[PDB]
Amino acid sequence: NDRKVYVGKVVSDKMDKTITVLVETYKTHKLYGKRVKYSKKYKTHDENNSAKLGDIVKIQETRPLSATKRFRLVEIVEES
Amino acid sequence: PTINQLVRKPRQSKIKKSDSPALNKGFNSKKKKFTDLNSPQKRGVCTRVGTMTPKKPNSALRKYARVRLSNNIEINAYIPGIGHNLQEHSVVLVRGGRVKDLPGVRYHIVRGALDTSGVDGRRQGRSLYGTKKPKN
Amino acid sequence: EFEERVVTINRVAKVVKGGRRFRFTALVVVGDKNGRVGFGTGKAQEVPEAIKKAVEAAKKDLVVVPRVEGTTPHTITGRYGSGSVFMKPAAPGTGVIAGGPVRAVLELAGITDILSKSLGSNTPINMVRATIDGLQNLKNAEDVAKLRGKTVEELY
Amino acid sequence: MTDPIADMLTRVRNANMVRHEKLELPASNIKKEIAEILKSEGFIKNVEYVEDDKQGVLRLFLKYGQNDERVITGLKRISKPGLRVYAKASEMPKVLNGLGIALVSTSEGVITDKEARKRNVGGEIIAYVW
RNA sequence: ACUUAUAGAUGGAUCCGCGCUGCAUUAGCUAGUUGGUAAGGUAACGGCUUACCAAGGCAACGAUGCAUAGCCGACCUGAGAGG
RNA sequence: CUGACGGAGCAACGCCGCGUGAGUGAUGAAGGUCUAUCGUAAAACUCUGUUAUUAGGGAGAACAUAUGUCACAUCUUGACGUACCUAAUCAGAAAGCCACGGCUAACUACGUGCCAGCAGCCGCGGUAAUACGUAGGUGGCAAGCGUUAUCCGGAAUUAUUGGGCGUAAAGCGCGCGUAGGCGGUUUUUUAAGUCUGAUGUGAAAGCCCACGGCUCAACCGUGGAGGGUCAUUGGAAACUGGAAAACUUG
RNA sequence: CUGGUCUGUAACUGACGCUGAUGUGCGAAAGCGUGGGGAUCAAACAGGAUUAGAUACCCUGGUAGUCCACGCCGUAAACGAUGAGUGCUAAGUGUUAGGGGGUGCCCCUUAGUGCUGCAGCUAACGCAUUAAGCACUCCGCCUGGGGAGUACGACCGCAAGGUUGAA
Known part of the structure; x- marks a missing residue:
């Protein structure tokens, strides 16, 4: 699973x-x-990276390790 | 008949209101507000006797009843039959709804019903305005 | 013989320069128990032989149910104005369901075995039309393929 | 012009109302499929394919039968951009107890209402042409 | 017949998901709205109180308020969707 | 220890297990709407135990260190523990039915002269209520008569299957016009999805079914229908889908 | 002074996207904004007069207005009670400045209107090569009547006022 x-x-x-x-x-x-x-x-998160102005990505459902945020994954398409 | 704006914007059903709104109700005094009940059975305790004259469609004469239900409001009745109960101050079994040809009254009497028995001039009815123990 | 059951018995009068003249409006069903029924415009002021007055002139307009074996081959919810009826095939012993004098054009046809209901209307002046169009849109087991242009066994 | 066949479909029955034929119509790659697979049953005078580019021109030339009567008595599409109703190839319905036919695209090439029942293939099954 | 390195287990569940109704007489959006950054701690990650800073995060899509507030084998029941 | 679970006045509340009359009878009377009708009414003869005088009433079922050496056991289980009660069995009545015409299914009238008054939508008495007061009953009935009011297919008066546009009860003041529902032709790069499916085939008491225990009905059960993409992601690019363009006269 | 409209094919570009609740909104005399405000008619009516029955549609004249370059609007039979994408099964016909072939002579829609009206549907009716009929469409309303917009009401707003809303 x-x-x-x-x-x-x-x-x-x-x-x-x-x-x-x-x-x-x-x-x-x-x-x-x-x-x-x-x-x-x-609600995902990075150091500062996965962010606004183009971050077409992937995300996850795992242990968040976060405040109320939930995701650890970024598997991309591209950038701008 | 187009379905896009149909989940954007819905439709209604018809528009109807049920029968006897000031009926099927038992008025509070502890918490002061009515009960939406639709009870099978209920009582009637009397305030006057009542009668109005101008009757076109029949054009004979017969009176009715002015019996108040709980705790300060106008509730009105009628006695459909050939039996005159020259009485009042009773404790009865209600009949719910109106019989034909009287506006605004929706409250009635079952045969017997703990107050009296009925107009005892009936023996063939065996099931109308007071008729108990009738040879079938 | 036609089972000559009275359809409907209606009154009008014509207001005049004197006492208006009544009449009785009627017809008869003319039922072979094979699928067709016509009508006679027995425009008159008599009730019982208006039945006969339609047995007189009925046969001008009767149309066929293209019968299938105690059934109809294809399914219909037509109407030529308002009165509509729904018709299907069915197992040849089904129970019979019908409305008005279309108990005289369903129970008097080469079917008897349906689930037939009158969609919407069911009046002495709509049941007929409803079923009339229902039966006017039919076909036998060997003829679609020709206005089509093949043999019928070329659909399954 | 967003559906390149839309009105053109019933234009069969809305052209042959009194069994008439003066209506030339435009094309597709399925207006190389709409009028080409019922000639499988002798239904058209001529639609062999569209002979042009840019989805051009085509004589509709709707065959009429021997009883004079509407080869296409009535007809509706129930599959249009704006009405997308997708079902399986099993209970594809009974098109007037099987009296009609269907000609449509599938999930494994191109079929008819003679294939969905015996191949389990198809997508937006379209219409009931009779 | 005692106390332990160890166990199969008990209600649960640390929790994930779709389960999870109505009121447009309630959109210029709560200051924590966006989420990273705490000494801490519950068999349990972590704005959960606190730890550090910038909000326009919102954004005319229901933020939010908000009114009955159990659900689920039951029962009358449809042809069937189920309702 | 049960006060968890049990032992029940039982409310004719559910509806059933069936019992309160028989072999019946020539048309049979002393006749009750009508003036032959329900009269095959009656009587006075016989038939069933099943209500009622008693009786013996033991239906289930296996309990237990020392008995000898968690499979487990004897010298250890009758308040209701009396049921099935055939039981000879007399004759131990199954209250009473509505409107009383025609639809909701009903039969005629004296009372009634508009005085009281009939009436489930329709609907009735002013001098023949084929309605009413009342009186012998045919349509349904015998543990059942009129009423009480809740959603069901029916209500096709939701329109998921089954929704009007000029007209019932309905169309844009329009130049304007965000979001997006929809949103050219052909090939399309997609290889997700539908085509549908290998698989997982993880249980159900019962399922789209049926049946077996049971004085048949209150009270229990085989589960082949796999438990409903659940433990694997698919091959058909014919396309809403990471989306390269060309066509042009629209 | 001033656009488009485009009537003929389309030079350029190789989809050059449809109903359009965001916004904006804006739309009849009067109601509305300058003081002009009379050419002086029309309201009120001064006033006569009436069959049995008049301050009156009648009647000379009579104070808003009748002679308007500036704030914003909106109720009307917006009775146009017609909502807008795709063609359409006889085309003629009246023809329109202006025109595909052309040259006060015959015309076809790339066109436009109003149609007698084939043809076929809707529902009794009407549309019709120049369509409510048949096929892909959105804001949607409608789904037996009142009363009912009267408790009450939420938000625009110089003003008529709107624009909401259980019983």
């Missing part, structure tokens, strides 16, 4: 690695059936 390759994109950040990655998925509602796409926000 291993740990996924959760991915996403980035929006903004604050002092000394208040890092994050975006979360999203393909799925629908149970009632009126439309392919409307949807999202919710996450």
Whole structure:
């Protein structure tokens, strides 16, 4: 039983690695059936690196080792 | 009939209100606020007798009852039948709802019902305005 | 013989320069128990032989159920205005379900074995039309393939 | 022009209303599939493929049968961009107890309503043409 | 028949997930909103009180408030979705 | 020690186990709506134990250092412990039914002269209530008569299957117009997903089923339907999907 | 002074994206902003007059307004009660400045309108090569009637006021 390759994109950040990655998925509602796409926000972190202005990455579900943040993974696409 | 804005924006059902809103209720005094109950059975204790004259559709004469329910409000009744209970101050079994042709009244009497028995001029009814122990 | 069951018995009058004239509006069902029923416009003021007055002129308009073996081969929810009916095949002993005088064009056809309901309307002036169109959209077991352009066994 | 076949579909039945044929229509790579696999059942006068680039031109030339009556009595698509309804190849429905046919793309090449039932292949199964 | 290096286990669960309802008469967003950085400590990582600094983190997507507040084999029940 | 679990006045609350009349009977009366009707009414004869005089009432079931040497055991288990109670068995009645026409399923009328008054949507008495006061019952019934009100398919008056546009009960003041629902042609780089699936095949008492214990009904059980991408990620690029462009007349 | 509209094909670029709740909003005399405010008619009505029945649609005249270059708007039968992408099964026809072939002579939509109206649907009706019919569309409303916008109400706002909302 291993740990996924959760991915996403980035929006903004604050002092000394208040890092994050975006979360999203393909799925629908149970009632009126439309392919409307949807999202919710996450909490990863680095030293200062995985951050705003382009950090398309991966994330994890592990021991956070964090305040209320939860992730340790960054497996990327590219940078800007 | 387009489904995009249907989870954006929903629809309604019809619009209806149930029957006898000031009924199926037992008024508080300890906590002062009513109970939404829909009880099977209930009582009726009397304040007046009551009668209004102008009847077009029938165009005969017959009175009704003005019986107050709990603790200061107007509650009104009617006696559908050929039996006149020249009485008051009773303790009864309620009948819920209105019979045809009287507006606003929704409260009635079961045959017998602990107060009296009924108009004893009936013996064929065996099941109307007081009729117990009737040879079938 | 037609089982000559009275369909519907309706009153109108025509207001005049004197005492208005009543009449009785009626027809008859003309049922071979094979699938067709027509009607006679027995426009008159008599109740019992308006049944007969439709047995007179009925045969101008009867149309066929392209019968399948106690059934219909394909499924229908049509209507030529409002009155609609739903029709399907079914096992040849099913129980019979119907509304008005279309107990005289479902129970009097080469089927009897359905799940048939009248979708929406069910009146003496819609049940007929409802079932009439239901039956006008049918076909036998060897003829779609020609306006199509093959043999029918070329669909499964 | 976002669906390159959309109205063109029922334009069969909305062109042959009184069994008529003067309607030339535009193309696709499935307007090299819409009118090419029911000629498998003698349904068209001629659509051999589209002979142009840029998804061009095509004579619709809708064959009409021997009873004079609507080769295509009625017809709807139930598969359009904006209406995406995807089902499996098992309970592909009974298209008027099997009286109609379907011609559609699959998850393993190209099939019909004669293949989904005996190959377990297909995606957005489209319509009921009769 | 005593006390220990050790155990299979007990309610649990340190916790992960989808389980996890309504009120638009409630969006310019809480100062901890973003998350890294503590002497600490619960069989249990860690803004959990504290440890250090910058917020526009928000952002017109429900932040948040917010009203009944158990769920789940049960029962009448649909053809079936289940409701 | 049970006050955890047990022993029950039992409420005709659930509904059943069935018992309160028989072989019945010529049309049979002294006739109760109508003026032949329910009259095959009746009687006075016989049939069943099953209610009732008694009786013996022992249904389940295996308990235990020393008995000799966690598999385990005798000289150790009847308040309800009396049930199945065939039991001869007399005759130990199964209250009473509604509206009383036609729909909700009902039969006719004297009372009634609009005085009281009938009435589940429809609906009735002013001088023939085929409604009412009341009176012998046919449609349903015998542990059952009118009522009490909750969501179910029915309600297709949610529209997930099953929603109107000019008109019921409904369309943009529009130049404007963020988010995004949707969002050209062809090849597409994708190799995720759907095609669907090897696998995991991890239990269910019962499942899409049925059946076996049981005076049949209150009270228990084989589980072949794998436990519902659960312990592995797929091959079909035909595409919403890391997304390179070309076509142009739109 | 002033754009587009584009009527013919499209020179350039090789998708050059559709309903459009963010915003902005803005839209009839009057209601609204300058003092002009009378050419003086029209409200009130001064006033007569009436069949049995008039301050009156009638009647000369009569104080906002009737003669407006500046703040912002919005209720009307916006009765246009028609919401906008894709074509469409006879085309003619009235024809439009302006035109594909052309040359006060015959025209077709790359076009435009109003249509008699084939053809086929909707629901009784109407649309129709120049479509409510059939196919991909969004803000959505509607899903038997009132009363009901009356407790009460939330937010715009110079003003009519809006714009909300259980019983």
